[model samples]
Target: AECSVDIQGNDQMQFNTNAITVDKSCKQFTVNLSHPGNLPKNVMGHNWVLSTAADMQGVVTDGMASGLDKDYLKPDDSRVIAHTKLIGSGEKDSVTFDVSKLKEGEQYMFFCTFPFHSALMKGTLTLK
Candidate 1:
């Protein structure tokens, strides 16, 4: 997946990949998320949310209030650079965006917004 990344979430509140790279030559990139575990969305819901490490906590803090109907994210929340829809067992979500959205040297991160899930389900992303 030259300009794309495939990541999976499981019942253990874990992600298969902990890091991501955006190729310098790619104009756009995609993140395909899948949940192979048997947990339901509300029980172990997962969404891939991208933001700076500094902004992650705040996003999750507010997102927790946004709840599942909103995919655990605030609507029009500019703090979110990009995100995928919530998914559960046997479900999946995907997101695609311009690579230019990430500037070189920024401390980028991706994580799940499901309450406590993000505390252990986050990863770093960089430009290559």
Candidate 2:
């Protein structure tokens, strides 16, 4: 069976879950993102981006300049293995990526690219 996960982002700049595990047997994985707040994207936007824990700072720093139209992410960023479109209140987005991109013992992290949201909306992901 395939593996799928759902997570929620709220106006408080926090994710509903802190950790996610990718099943080794799954050929692919899917992440469903939902925003259940009442704020607009300019005020409280959220996005899901996956990258190595070590490259997070650089990726996010450059992404901040990419702006909301680009989902606050650098275009074709090699460090970003996968990402979802930014969503605002009552909006949702999803992304599926090959599980093979992940390696055992490697450190992976998922975070929101919205300005200061990374301070609170970030989590570790691992293959198990």
Candidate 3:
């Protein structure tokens, strides 16, 4: 089956879906993220970052210093498998990456690294 997902981030600091599955047969997976709220990027920005659940906290912590220009993600951070550009209200972004980067038994997570948004804007990505 094809592996593609549509995720939404609103000004409320929440994601529409908490979990997603990527088919083993898919060579590449795509994630499209959109923020429908009216807030600006400085206030309620959102981005989609994919990494192992175990590395989520560390990545988010270091990412804080990367700033909005870097999409709040560390430069050349191997822990990050894929990420969409940071977007604000009424904006959208998408990322496509190789599914081979994922390990079957590893726990993978997706979340927004926009300041304190991680508390509520986070989810899981499973490969099957």
Q: Please estimate how well model 3 matches the true structure, expressed as its whole-model Cα lDDT.
A: 0.91
Q: Residue 88's C-alpha lDDT in candidate 3?
A: 89
User: Candidate 1's C-alpha lDDT?
Assistant: 0.92
Candidate 3, which segments miss by more than 4 Å at Cα? none
lDDT of 1 at 73: 94
Query: Deviation in angstroms for 112 in model 1?
Result: 0.4
Indicate the TM-score of model 3: 0.96
Q: Candidate 2 lDDT, tens digit per residue, 27-127?
A: 99999999999999889999889999998998889899989888899888899999988999999999999999999999999999888888899999999
lDDT of each residue in 8-61, candidate 3, tens digit only: 998799898999999999999999999989999988999999999989998899
TM-score of 2: 0.96
Return the candidate ranking by lDDT, descending.
1, 2, 3
Q: Show the lowest summed lDDT stretch of 10 residues, model 2.
A: 1-10
